Design a protein around this nucleic acid. Structure first.
Ligand SMILES: [Zn+2]
Ligand SMILES: [Zn+2]
Ligand SMILES: [Zn+2]
Ligand SMILES: [Zn+2]
Length: 115
DNA sequence: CGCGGGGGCGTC
DNA sequence: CAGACGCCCCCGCG
């Protein structure tokens, strides 16, 4: 049993390899991490998750707009904002000829919902 | 109404 | 524990 499971607090061996691959599946949805913040007791399954959530407090804005020089807490958000300039709109309204385009997927969804 | 910003989740 | 990229979803605001 060289092998061991990575989940926190549940350290233990496993003779074979596949005999362990299957174990982890147990930890499938546990929330090992939490936020060491005042009254903000929120648990996160993944690590990058918590890391990110941190910024809500920290204030950090790790990403910056090459154009507006504006900083954002998330890359996906910046990614979008980048269209503020590019003027890209990959989402066309699927209704009869109401050929309106939107930069964000959901931005469209709300359009439809208004039709 | 366009877009900021936070959640959750699949994935290499 | 795999950090990091990418989306959908949903809400709030000027
Ligand atoms: Zn385990
Ligand atoms: Zn917190
Ligand atoms: Zn910009
Ligand atoms: Zn339309």
């Amino acid at each position: 049993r060289p092998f061991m499971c990575a989940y926190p607090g549940c350290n233990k061996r496993y003779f074979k390899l596949s005999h362990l691959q299957m174990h982890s599946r147990k930890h499938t949805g546990e929330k090992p991490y939490q936020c060491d913040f005042k009254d903000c007791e929120r648990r996160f399954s993944r690590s990058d998750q918590l890391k990110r959530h941190q910024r809500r407090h920290t204030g950090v804005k790790p990403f910056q707009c090459k154009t507006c020089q504006r900083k954002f807490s998330r890359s996906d958000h910046l990614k979008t904002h980048t269209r503020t300039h590019t003027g890209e709109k990959p989402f066309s309204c699927r209704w009869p000829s109401c050929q309106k385009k939107f930069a964000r997927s959901d931005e469209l969804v709300r359009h439809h919902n208004m039709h």
